[PDB]
Design a protein around this motif. Structure first.
Motif, mmCIF file in Angstrom:
data_model
loop_
_atom_site.group_PDB
_atom_site.id
_atom_site.type_symbol
_atom_site.label_atom_id
_atom_site.label_comp_id
_atom_site.label_asym_id
_atom_site.label_seq_id
_atom_site.Cartn_x
_atom_site.Cartn_y
_atom_site.Cartn_z
ATOM 1 N N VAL B 217 0.817 -1.207 0.000
ATOM 2 C CA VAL B 217 0.000 0.000 0.000
ATOM 3 C C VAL B 217 0.857 1.266 0.000
ATOM 4 O O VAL B 217 1.164 1.813 1.059
ATOM 5 C CB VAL B 217 -0.944 0.029 1.215
ATOM 6 C CG1 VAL B 217 -1.975 1.123 1.048
ATOM 7 C CG2 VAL B 217 -1.624 -1.318 1.389
ATOM 8 N N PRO B 218 1.237 1.741 -1.196
ATOM 9 C CA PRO B 218 2.107 2.914 -1.343
ATOM 10 C C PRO B 218 1.495 4.180 -0.744
ATOM 11 O O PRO B 218 0.283 4.377 -0.820
ATOM 12 C CB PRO B 218 2.256 3.056 -2.862
ATOM 13 C CG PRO B 218 1.090 2.332 -3.435
ATOM 14 C CD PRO B 218 0.823 1.196 -2.498
ATOM 15 N N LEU B 219 2.337 5.028 -0.159
ATOM 16 C CA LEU B 219 1.872 6.236 0.520
ATOM 17 C C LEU B 219 1.223 7.251 -0.419
ATOM 18 O O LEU B 219 0.278 7.940 -0.035
ATOM 19 C CB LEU B 219 3.018 6.897 1.292
ATOM 20 C CG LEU B 219 3.380 6.261 2.632
ATOM 21 C CD1 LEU B 219 4.582 6.956 3.255
ATOM 22 C CD2 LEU B 219 2.184 6.310 3.567
ATOM 23 N N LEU B 222 -2.942 7.567 -1.048
ATOM 24 C CA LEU B 222 -3.934 7.975 -0.061
ATOM 25 C C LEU B 222 -4.925 8.981 -0.636
ATOM 26 O O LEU B 222 -6.106 8.970 -0.287
ATOM 27 C CB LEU B 222 -3.252 8.544 1.185
ATOM 28 C CG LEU B 222 -2.282 7.602 1.903
ATOM 29 C CD1 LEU B 222 -1.577 8.318 3.047
ATOM 30 C CD2 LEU B 222 -2.987 6.344 2.403
ATOM 31 N N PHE B 387 -2.328 -4.311 7.353
ATOM 32 C CA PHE B 387 -1.502 -3.552 6.418
ATOM 33 C C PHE B 387 -2.291 -2.431 5.741
ATOM 34 O O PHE B 387 -1.718 -1.433 5.300
ATOM 35 C CB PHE B 387 -0.902 -4.476 5.356
ATOM 36 C CG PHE B 387 -0.020 -5.556 5.916
ATOM 37 C CD1 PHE B 387 1.288 -5.281 6.279
ATOM 38 C CD2 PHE B 387 -0.495 -6.848 6.068
ATOM 39 C CE1 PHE B 387 2.104 -6.275 6.789
ATOM 40 C CE2 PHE B 387 0.317 -7.847 6.578
ATOM 41 C CZ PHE B 387 1.617 -7.560 6.939
ATOM 42 N N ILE B 389 -4.303 -0.302 6.953
ATOM 43 C CA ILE B 389 -4.812 0.639 7.953
ATOM 44 C C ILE B 389 -4.890 2.105 7.505
ATOM 45 O O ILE B 389 -5.913 2.755 7.709
ATOM 46 C CB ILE B 389 -4.060 0.538 9.301
ATOM 47 C CG1 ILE B 389 -4.786 1.367 10.364
ATOM 48 C CG2 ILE B 389 -2.612 0.976 9.148
ATOM 49 C CD1 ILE B 389 -4.162 1.301 11.733
ATOM 50 N N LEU B 390 -3.824 2.632 6.908
ATOM 51 C CA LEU B 390 -3.833 4.037 6.498
ATOM 52 C C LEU B 390 -4.975 4.359 5.535
ATOM 53 O O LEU B 390 -5.738 5.292 5.774
ATOM 54 C CB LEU B 390 -2.483 4.476 5.925
ATOM 55 C CG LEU B 390 -1.392 4.696 6.973
ATOM 56 C CD1 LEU B 390 -0.154 5.327 6.353
ATOM 57 C CD2 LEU B 390 -1.921 5.560 8.101
ATOM 58 N N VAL B 394 -8.213 6.784 6.643
ATOM 59 C CA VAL B 394 -8.593 7.927 5.823
ATOM 60 C C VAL B 394 -9.973 7.750 5.192
ATOM 61 O O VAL B 394 -10.868 8.560 5.412
ATOM 62 C CB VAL B 394 -7.562 8.205 4.715
ATOM 63 C CG1 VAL B 394 -8.050 9.333 3.820
ATOM 64 C CG2 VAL B 394 -6.210 8.545 5.319
#
Ligand SMILES: [Cl-]
Ligand SMILES: [Cl-]
Lengths: 425, 425
Positions: B217-219, B222, B387, B389-390, B394
């Motif tokens: 999951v690349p930043l 988002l 994994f 979660i972010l 959001v």
């Protein structure tokens, strides 16, 4: 039932503490390895480095104790008590003093190899930023408490790359009012998210110790974690008691002993930094040592006793600390030792014994703090492993129940009553 | 600050609601598949099965609506509003009436293929048991509140094999007092643990849909979930608004329409059960349909509309329901379509598109309910995947904000206001 201006404020809070917490950790680690590389350059000839590393460590810690008082003795120890207090009424919080002193001071303490404690600084620095931006935003009375709570939460999330943990922290332990705007949850989540997103951009993105592939956890193994809980129960009990007795001893001066307390304490830690064993630093190393470096069962017992005492001495002296990580390191060392032993006795019920090591990783925290819900989340977030939840749930809250069954009391509420007793510091 | 007698009481509560919740689910499924097999035996010749399945389904739902009033109209709909109500003063709860009617009646509804809703019956039946055992144990006033909450949390935990979820439920949404014994947390956990343990012995131990190996999951992805949130935001908005309108229409009689409402509404559902699509039943099927059975992007849009409307009609009719699962099926169907689309557009930022599906899985719940924290934990607990979660964080809390920015109001607090407005039923 939420309100925009406060949400964007949280975005800012978590954002700031994120950058700070991350840079702070990076800074501390640089200092840590720099003192480690200095010890090797001089290592060849002979114990010259023994003297050099002793001075640097002792000097930093002392310089740290000095920067504490006079300047902001409020920054002494953890940070949960100081923010839990302020948020509740007693005890004040002034960011212009905490922020810089906790940072510069905390850097010196941790960087010297003290048995703390990132969440210590990052949690108070969090609250400070939460307040510092609370004013900038001309937030109402209640809203400012929230912003401070957010900072506190974001502070924990930044230390362990654990959003949910930070959120749960404020919720379970340090239960505040929020009246009736209980939807400070959103503010929390927002603050935590941002904090970790920044934390991951800077040093992320992986967890502290991902053990995601240990998922075989038979149901008829649960009875074990009850015992493991009973164990961490009494363990947490004596840890609290011991801490307080060591806290008294340090309170009892003498005026001269205190002058040297800073240097002496820091110089011994400096010596112990040299041995190839995780008996200093925050505790992350201790955890990254339990798992995975296979080491003699005896050495486990050895490092456990070392750290268990040393953390008491370090935090007991009232240095700019933080007690969370140190208890993670102590537990993870014990849980591994116990994992081995139980696998020895019932391999059919503990196929993967890592499961047990994970379960008891947050058990000491749950017992000493009375916060099982957050201890549980913390470990999940720092192992990416949810499969171990049932063992986790049982061991953590049984440890909590057994602890406050022997009458141990929440280490933070006690640490608050004491810091309150200093209404004349 | 906790006290033993109550803890073991929580153990018993969770133990009971666990067994009941488990058996109830199994009982409902058996009925569900039995009607499916009955339809296939008569399938060959010809639409004779069309009539039989129509009668069986219609009859059950009718008999269900009858057993409701007169007997215990309190059991109509979800269960959160009724327990959130009692737990707060307004609205009484008598276990001797709820427990049997919610069960027997809920079985008929769900077993007939209604668009609900395990967490409906199980969460109310939990509250009942919580009270039922509170009396047996002679628990104090506050303690009995706790046990009722414990029962409610255990109810949710039993429906999704998700301990933390059931805990987060009581915490975030349905925020109770507990004064000052806020360490009902321990009671909750204890209760939820036992609940899922029993649940796993009976039908465990795997999660509802474990997508544990999707972890890339690349930043810089988002930004996508901020949109996914905006989407689920307005979605939850119109879902709430729509539900209320359908509720009003159903409230407006006529006396004769009600007599048939049970049979008619239950018979149409009966027919739709025959088609090979997950457009009836709780919603688990719908989720186990989004993933994994690859299906036409058009059929997704089809089933999404079908269920989105059918759930409004179903719950709007006031049948013994439950709204969590339905909003999980709808969301996951949408998030899967969305996942495909964003993968189509930006594959470099959405390597595994399952991540996006997982994320928006609880987004509808977070929007309509105002409870993002629990929606998050729910998805994690039923995928074993942390994994994600972010994005999860959001997409969910953004969706919660957007919804209560268009002025949506928590679906439960509103549903409770309406049930209170029946202070004369
Ligand atoms: Cl701490
Ligand atoms: Cl529901």
């Amino acid at each position: 039932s939420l309100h925009p201006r406060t949400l964007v404020a949280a975005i800012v809070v978590g954002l700031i503490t994120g950058v700070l917490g991350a840079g702070f950790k990076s800074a501390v680690n640089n200092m840590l390895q720099w003192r480690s590389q200095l010890a090797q350059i001089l290592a060849p000839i002979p114990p010259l480095a023994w003297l050099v590393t002793a001075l640097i460590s002792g000097g930093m810690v002392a310089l740290s104790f000095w920067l504490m008082k006079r300047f902001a003795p409020d920054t002494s120890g953890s940070g949960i008590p100081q923010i839990e207090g302020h948020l509740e009424g007693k005890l004040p919080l002034v960011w212009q003093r905490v922020l810089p002193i906790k940072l510069v001071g905390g850097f010196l303490s941790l960087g010297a190899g003290m048995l703390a404690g990132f969440e210590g600084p990052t949690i108070q620095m969090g609250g400070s930023i939460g307040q510092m931006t609370g004013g900038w935003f001309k937030a109402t009375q209640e809203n400012q408490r929230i912003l401070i709570a957010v900072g506190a939460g974001a502070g924990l999330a930044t230390a362990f790359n654990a959003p949910l943990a930070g959120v749960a922290l404020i919720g379970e332990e340090m239960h505040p009012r929020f009246r009736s705007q209980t939807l400070a949850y959103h503010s929390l989540l927002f603050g935590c998210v941002m904090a970790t997103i920044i934390l991951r951009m800077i040093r992320g993105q992986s967890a502290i110790i991902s053990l995601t592939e240990f998922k075989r956890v038979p149901l008829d193994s649960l009875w074990m974690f009850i015992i493991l809980g009973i164990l961490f129960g009494v363990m947490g009990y004596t840890f609290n008691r011991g801490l307080f007795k060591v806290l008294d001893w340090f309170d009892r001066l003498p005026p001269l002993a205190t002058k040297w307390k800073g240097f002496l304490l820091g110089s011994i830690i400096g010596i112990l930094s040299l041995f190839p064993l995780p008996l200093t630093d925050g505790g992350d190393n201790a955890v990254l040592w339990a798992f995975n470096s296979q080491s003699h069962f005896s050495t486990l017992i050895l490092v456990f006793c070392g750290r268990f005492l040393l953390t008491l001495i370090c935090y007991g002296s009232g240095a700019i600390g933080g007690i969370f990580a140190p208890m993670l390191g102590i537990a993870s060392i014990v849980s591994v030792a116990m994992a081995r032993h139980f696998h020895l006795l019932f391999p059919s019920q503990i196929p993967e014994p890592a499961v047990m090591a994970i379960a008891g990783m947050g058990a000491l925290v749950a017992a000493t703090v009375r916060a099982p819900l957050t201890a549980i989340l913390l470990t999940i977030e720092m192992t990416d492993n949810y499969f171990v939840i049932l063992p986790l749930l049982v061991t953590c809250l049984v440890a909590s129940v057994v602890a406050e069954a022997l009458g141990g009391k929440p280490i933070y509420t006690v640490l608050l009553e004491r810091t309150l007793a200093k209404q004349n510091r």
